[PDB]
Amino acid sequence: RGGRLCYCRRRFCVCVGR
């Protein structure tokens, strides 16, 4: 959808539009 942010779960970052 609209928006963006990345989060790191241990040693892997993940980026989504939510």
Place this chain on the structure above:
Amino acid sequence: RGGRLCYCRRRFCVCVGR
């Protein structure tokens, strides 16, 4: 925009609507 799919580049996954 419309649609959704997620891809991984090494140990980092991204998700977008394009």
